Design a protein around this motif. Structure first.
Motif, short mmCIF file in Angstrom:
data_model
loop_
_atom_site.label_atom_id
_atom_site.label_comp_id
_atom_site.label_asym_id
_atom_site.label_seq_id
_atom_site.Cartn_x
_atom_site.Cartn_y
_atom_site.Cartn_z
N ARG A 266 0.75 -1.29 -0.01
CA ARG A 266 -0.18 0.01 0.03
C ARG A 266 0.58 1.43 -0.03
O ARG A 266 0.45 2.11 -0.71
CB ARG A 266 -1.07 0.02 1.11
CG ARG A 266 -1.60 1.22 1.16
CD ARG A 266 -2.89 1.56 2.25
NE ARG A 266 -2.24 1.30 3.69
CZ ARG A 266 -1.24 2.14 4.17
NH1 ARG A 266 -0.84 3.33 3.51
NH2 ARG A 266 -0.71 1.86 5.27
N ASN B 70 0.96 3.95 -3.25
CA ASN B 70 0.36 5.51 -3.15
C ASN B 70 1.39 6.60 -3.00
O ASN B 70 1.22 7.55 -3.80
CB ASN B 70 -0.62 5.54 -2.12
CG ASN B 70 -1.90 4.55 -2.10
OD1 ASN B 70 -2.22 4.24 -3.04
ND2 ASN B 70 -2.53 4.01 -1.06
N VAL C 162 -6.05 5.41 -6.05
CA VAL C 162 -5.41 5.57 -4.59
C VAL C 162 -6.15 4.43 -3.85
O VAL C 162 -7.43 4.40 -3.56
CB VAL C 162 -5.65 6.88 -4.06
CG1 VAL C 162 -5.38 7.10 -2.48
CG2 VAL C 162 -5.36 8.21 -4.79
#
Ligand SMILES: CCCCCCCCCCCCCC(=O)CSCCNC(=O)CCNC(=O)[C@H](O)C(C)(C)COP(=O)(O)OP(=O)(O)OC[C@H]1O[C@@H](n2cnc3c(N)ncnc32)[C@H](O)[C@@H]1OP(=O)(O)O
Ligand SMILES: [Mg+2]
Length: 388
Positions: free
Chosen positions: A242, A246, A257
């Motif tokens: 993650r 991002n 996102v």
């Protein structure tokens, strides 16, 4: 063949999207959110009906599979058709936030034969400085017999309706054909992993004059990967993946996102669907990951083989390892898994390796599109979104 003329967007003219070749210098929704939305389904041609497909039902999935196996995307020359597996479809169509009313089918009223389908799934999408709740639209398909009877605009209106219901008013979608109006145009590139089978299937194209032996020798890959720390992703990585994705995606004009529930959905390895390999830096902390998905194509009209096995570059994130070294390992990994061809678009930074890892350029474009959003058209290199 030759027949150049000029098209009127009978359906698309009517829709919230920019006219083909208007010059856009602005940023924002083409029209505001519909605070009152139509509650009744659009009308189908007689003999035909709406079905919300439940893919949990094994027989329904099997129908959906067969629809697409037989009537989905084909190349220009029409020697190849996408052969999306039933489980691949389950992965693609049921991410976090998915709703079943978004799996929209069209069936034959009398004998119940599935003849149409369109799908939507939720995603947070960053166009320049605006991150919007959108959906991604995929798997538009109308049966070959039913082509050219204006059924595609029924399904598009209908899915536009069921998404609007839910408070979403923007969407993203790609297609291999020109519509109003491309934000960007990417080009598929292909990397031979197995050039003999590619030649017998007639996918390439021995560059006369070139022997087979010399081709095979050019595309030769090692048997084992180079990067220290390189391994499959496991649940414990979810959080660091993650963060890494991002952050990396910040540089691109178009990008999702993702939260962690989405990260686990899209990246945890599933055999013959999605592969993700992470680079663990000399201690224990993650610095890079490559991923790629599995999509075979039906070879139409051929004696030797009926299926060509392809890997699709997905998201490849680099902080410590250089990208060309990561991608070299992606190729090696795909080769050693029996894939015949590695496919990648020229979006993100992919241009920085294509030529160097001996990819060749392929026919046709992939246009990227937004629904109900104006913004200037940026380059392939500034696109950081990948759809199945
Ligand atoms: C806020 C939520 C918003 C949700 C929705 C947002 C937008 C979502 C949009 C969907 C994005 C999907 C993304 C996606 O799935 C990835 S692109 C994959 C599309 N599917 C295929 O290529 C399968 C093989 N072809 C077919 O099945 C049919 O030919 C299709 C189904 C394409 C059309 O079947 P048909 O029997 O050949 O066509 P008619 O019924 O006669 O209808 C003709 C009208 O359809 C317009 N057309 C043709 N191809 C299109 C395409 N790829 N996108 C949009 N529109 C397309 C065409 O320009 C004409 O409009 P016009 O008169 O204005 O020129
Ligand atoms: Mg039609």
């Amino acid at each position: 063949m030759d027949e150049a003329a000029k098209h009127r967007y009978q359906f698309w003219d009517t829709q919230p999207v920019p006219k083909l070749d208007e010059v856009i210098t602005s940023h924002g929704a083409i029209e505001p959110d519909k605070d009152n939305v139509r509650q009744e389904p659009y009308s189908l041609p007689q003999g035909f009906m709406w079905d919300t497909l439940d893919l949990s039902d094994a027989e329904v999935l099997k129908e959906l599979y067969t629809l697409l196996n037989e009537n989905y995307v084909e190349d220009d020359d029409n020697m190849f058709r996408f052969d999306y597996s039933p489980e691949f479809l389950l992965w693609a169509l049921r991410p976090p936030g998915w709703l079943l009313q978004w799996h929209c089918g069209v069936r034959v009223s009398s004998n119940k034969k599935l003849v149409g389908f369109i799908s939507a799934i939720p995603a947070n999408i960053r166009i320049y400085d605006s991150v919007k709740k959108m959906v991604e639209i995929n798997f538009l398909c109308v049966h070959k017999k039913l082509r050219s009877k204006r059924v595609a605009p029924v399904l598009i209106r209908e899915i536009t309706r069921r998404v609007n219901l839910e408070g979403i008013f923007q969407a993203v979608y790609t297609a291999g054909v020109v519509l109003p109006k491309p934000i960007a145009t990417c080009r598929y590139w292909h990397r031979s992993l197995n050039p003999k089978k590619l030649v017998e299937v007639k996918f390439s194209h021995l560059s006369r004059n070139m022997t087979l032996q010399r081709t095979m020798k050019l595309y030769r890959l090692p048997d084992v990967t180079k990067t220290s720390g390189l391994r499959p992703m496991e649940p414990k990585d979810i959080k660091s993946v993650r963060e890494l994705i991002n952050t990396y995606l910040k540089q691109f004009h178009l990008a999702p996102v993702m939260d962690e529930e989405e990260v686990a959905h899209w990246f945890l390895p599933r055999e013959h669907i999605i592969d993700t390999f992470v680079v663990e830096s000399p201690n224990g902390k993650l610095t890079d990951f490559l991923s790629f998905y599995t999509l075979p194509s039906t070879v139409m009209h051929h004696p030797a083989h009926k299926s060509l096995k392809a890997a699709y570059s997905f998201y490849n994130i680099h902080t410590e390892t250089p990208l060309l070294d990561l991608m070299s390992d992606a190729l090696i990994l795909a080769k050693s898994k029996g894939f015949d061809v590695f496919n990648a678009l020229d979006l993100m930074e992919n241009k920085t390796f294509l030529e160097k890892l001996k990819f060749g350029i392929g026919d046709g474009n992939l246009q990227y599109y937004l629904y109900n959003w104006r913004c200037p058209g940026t380059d392939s290199e500034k696109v950081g979104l990948v759809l199945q």
